[PDB]
Design an enzyme around this catalytic site. Structure first.
Site, PDB file in Angstrom:
ATOM      1  CD  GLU A 164      69.002   4.972 -95.467  1.00  0.00           C
ATOM      2  OE1 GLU A 164      67.875   5.613 -94.736  1.00  0.00           O
ATOM      3  OE2 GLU A 164      69.122   4.652 -96.681  1.00  0.00           O
ATOM      4  CD  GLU A 197      67.669   7.357 -99.780  1.00  0.00           C
ATOM      5  OE1 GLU A 197      66.554   7.085-100.268  1.00  0.00           O
ATOM      6  OE2 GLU A 197      68.217   6.672 -98.892  1.00  0.00           O
ATOM      7  CG  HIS A 238      65.879  13.110 -95.080  1.00  0.00           C
ATOM      8  ND1 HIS A 238      64.946  12.170 -95.458  1.00  0.00           N
ATOM      9  CD2 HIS A 238      66.935  12.417 -94.596  1.00  0.00           C
ATOM     10  CE1 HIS A 238      65.414  10.962 -95.206  1.00  0.00           C
ATOM     11  NE2 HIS A 238      66.618  11.084 -94.681  1.00  0.00           N
ATOM     12  CE1 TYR A 277      68.137   0.388 -94.600  1.00  0.00           C
ATOM     13  CE2 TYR A 277      68.720   1.964 -96.314  1.00  0.00           C
ATOM     14  CZ  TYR A 277      68.370   1.690 -95.013  1.00  0.00           C
ATOM     15  OH  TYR A 277      68.218   2.720 -94.127  1.00  0.00           O
ATOM     16  NE  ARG A 279      72.337  11.112 -93.065  1.00  0.00           N
ATOM     17  CZ  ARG A 279      71.751  10.936 -94.249  1.00  0.00           C
ATOM     18  NH1 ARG A 279      72.101  11.664 -95.300  1.00  0.00           N
ATOM     19  NH2 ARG A 279      70.796  10.028 -94.384  1.00  0.00           N
ATOM     20  CG  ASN A 323      71.413   6.719 -97.619  1.00  0.00           C
ATOM     21  OD1 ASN A 323      72.431   6.955 -96.963  1.00  0.00           O
ATOM     22  ND2 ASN A 323      70.301   7.456 -97.511  1.00  0.00           N
TER      23      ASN A 323
END
Ligand SMILES: *[C@H]1O[C@H](CO)[C@@H](O)[C@H](O)[C@H]1F
Length: 445
Positions: free
Chosen positions: A353, A164, A119, A295, A76, A293
């Site tokens: 991600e 995002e 992005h 984390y 990607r 995404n």
């Protein structure tokens, strides 16, 4: 005690155009908003800029080759808008060409690409007109999106519209932490509205052109926990939840903004005046999948300060990355479950991600990033538990194939599984990268 993933689980790696490419003033590329942003004192650690970066603009043939040997089948990437539309209506052939040659290599190596349209690297000339705070910018995106879809489309298996929307709007115009760096909540919400529409815009151009490749948007989401059982903390967590998750997920699957949040913003929403007839409908287009995404989770408490949300983020010091982010893989399984339950309840989920930044050291040509390694594995166990339990997770792209410009953190933070030596630009795979190659082999662990 083993974790074997589906037969068709898509494994890949992700990167971003401004974060790796370099070649900022080459091939006709004009400045993007981050090139202006990185220049403001105190906005990015060490004053780092996206100048050169990993120089993927010149080392791309090797990087894609390096991917193949690493065992990856999916890649990607994102297209640099400033490289395609350096100015109002001009179309830079030299730029459409760079990605073309890039695609040649992708296919030559035998990989399946995923082209991310936006992005965060908006053309500065567009920010000059007002950037994302202007409806007209949506028209400029349509132009950009059409060119790329026509110039390709017959070679793209997956389209990732916006990566995002929360960062580019909330952080770009609201907190001033990302580019262009404005601090105005009325702009952040207007910008979040316009970028969310650009997802619909691309989804329409997609159906009209009759493309066969998949299409979906990417939302960064986070599982939220209340700091204590106090009523105000629970209310605080709810707000944080709608602030990052619901405000972008609600319009995508429900065609509406969170009512509680709409009230909490009030004045700043200016009465939803930025919403025109047909906008919400335009935005409510899930597509063929939902990119996520993740984390870390957030622990929230209440405060009565001068901030928009009036929420405080308890900084968990226990197991954290080099960025100070807590390592709670349980929350990933928890967030994925909540995503299926609401919003995607069915629609394929793709993790576009996931990864971590740790301190890296070279020990005779090899990097023993046991830390990063443990992070991917543990989080993969969460994805596995989601699957097996009925979870519709069909893919996973480890964030950062190579160390790169980590936005406001600059180069100080390395998310790569492949080490980058910025003094020489030479690539060197980390142990975690070797672990991933073996893993994808047996398709498990
Ligand atoms: C996901 O987050 C990472 C870590 O901050 C960024 O480098 C990527 O651009 C984003 F899509």
């Amino acid at each position: 005690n083993t974790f074997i993933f589906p037969a068709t689980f898509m494994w890949g790696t992700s990167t971003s155009s401004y974060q790796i490419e370099g070649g900022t003033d080459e091939g006709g590329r004009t400045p993007s908003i981050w090139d202006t942003f990185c220049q403001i004192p105190g906005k990015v650690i060490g004053g780092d800029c996206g100048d050169v970066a990993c120089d993927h603009f010149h080392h791309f043939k090797e990087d894609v080759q390096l991917m193949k040997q690493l065992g990856f089948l999916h890649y990607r990437f994102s297209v640099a808008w400033p490289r395609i539309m350096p100015a109002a209506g001009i179309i830079n052939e030299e730029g459409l060409l760079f990605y073309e040659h890039l695609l040649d290599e992708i296919e030559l190596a035998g990989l399946i690409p995923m082209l991310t349209l936006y992005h965060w690297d908006l053309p500065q000339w567009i920010e000059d007109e007002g950037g994302w705070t202007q409806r007209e910018t949506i028209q400029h995106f349509k132009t950009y999106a059409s060119v790329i879809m026509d110039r390709f489309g017959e070679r793209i298996n997956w389209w990732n519209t916006i990566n995002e929307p929360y960062c580019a709007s909330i952080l770009g115009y609201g907190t001033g932490e990302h580019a262009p760096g404005h601090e105005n909540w009325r702009e952040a919400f207007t910008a979040a509205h316009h970028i969310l529409m650009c997802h619909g815009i691309a989804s329409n151009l997609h159906k009209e052109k009759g493309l066969t490749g998949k299409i979906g948007i990417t939302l960064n989401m986070e599982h939220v926990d209340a700091a204590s059982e106090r009523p105000e903390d629970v209310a605080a967590a709810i707000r944080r939840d709608g602030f990052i998750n619901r405000w972008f997920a609600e319009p995508l699957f429900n065609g509406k903004y969170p009512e509680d949040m709409v009230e909490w913003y009030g004045t700043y929403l200016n009465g939803l005046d930025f919403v025109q007839p047909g906008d919400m409908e335009l935005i409510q287009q899930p597509g063929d999948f939902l990119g996520i995404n993740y984390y870390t989770r957030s622990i929230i408490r209440s405060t009565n300060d001068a901030s928009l949300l009036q929420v405080e983020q308890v900084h968990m010091e226990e197991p954290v990355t080099d960025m100070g982010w807590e390592i709670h893989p349980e929350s990933f399984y928890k967030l994925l479950t909540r995503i299926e339950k609401d919003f995607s309840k069915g629609l394929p989920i793709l993790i576009t991600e996931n990864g971590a930044a740790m301190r890296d050291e070279l020990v005779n040509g090899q990097i023993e990033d046991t830390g990063r390694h443990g992070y991917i594995e543990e989080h993969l166990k969460a994805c596995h538990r989601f699957i097996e339990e009925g979870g519709q997770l069909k893919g996973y792209f480890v964030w950062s194939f190579l160390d790169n410009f980590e936005w406001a953190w600059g180069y100080s933070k390395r998310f790569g599984i492949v080490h980058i030596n910025y003094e020489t630009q030479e690539r060197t795979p980390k142990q975690s990268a070797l672990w991933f190659k073996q893993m994808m082999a047996k398709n498990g662990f």
